[PDB]
Design a protein around this ligand. Structure first.
Ligand SMILES: CC[C@@H](C)N(C)C(=O)c1cc2ccccc2c(-c2ccccc2Cl)n1
Length: 169
């Protein structure tokens, strides 16, 4: 009978499966690919970075607690946000199934997916009822820009600043 919010805890652990198995692809396939193309793979390995969910998890637990504490603890009213968030995030953020497309520049689907999944879902789910929590998450945008910018960098790395001549003589 955990003292902390059982819902927020488990539901917050859910993204741990999609985020773990998700990035698990770049964990090895990424470290290697870097040997071929130029990638910012120099950033601390998922070992030190992956803790992204650890920090956001702490803030999450806090926000959640507030949301439910407002509408009145965890009730049928809290099941709509928490749930709609778990379900929407599951099928929507479920980006690990793109392993097949992870070998293509489309690999960006990861960032775009998880970014809009937790962000969008939390906007209509949590921020919709409790605006204060949204502030505890606010510092999560940096993370969104982290992955998002990552992919953007790769693209411009192998293909950027285009506009030259052809053959001519
Ligand atoms: C490529 C280096 C990755 C492992 N890195 C240091 C990250 O911080 C990171 C963590 C993640 C955690 C969960 C899901 C994705 C990521 C992505 C990432 C960013 C853009 C595209 C694909 C991926 Cl796995 N990147």
């Amino acid at each position: 009978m955990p003292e902390s919010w059982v819902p927020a805890v488990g539901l917050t652990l859910v993204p741990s499966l999609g985020g773990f198995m998700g990035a698990y692809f770049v964990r090895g396939e990424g470290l290697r690919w870097y040997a071929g193309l130029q990638k910012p793979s120099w950033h601390p390995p998922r070992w030190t970075l992956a803790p992204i969910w650890g920090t956001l998890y702490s803030a999450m637990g806090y926000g959640s607690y507030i949301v439910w504490k407002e509408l009145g603890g965890f009730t049928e009213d809290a099941m709509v946000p928490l749930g709609l968030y778990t379900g929407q995030l599951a099928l929507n953020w479920a980006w690990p199934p793109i392993f097949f497309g992870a070998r293509q520049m489309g690999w960006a689907l990861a960032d775009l997916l998880l970014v809009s999944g937790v962000a969008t879902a939390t906007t209509l789910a949590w921020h919709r009822v409790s605006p204060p929590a949204a502030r505890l998450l606010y510092p999560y945008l940096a993370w969104l820009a982290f992955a998002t910018v990552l992919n953007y960098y790769v693209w411009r790395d192998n293909s950027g600043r285009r506009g030259g001549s052809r053959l001519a003589e």
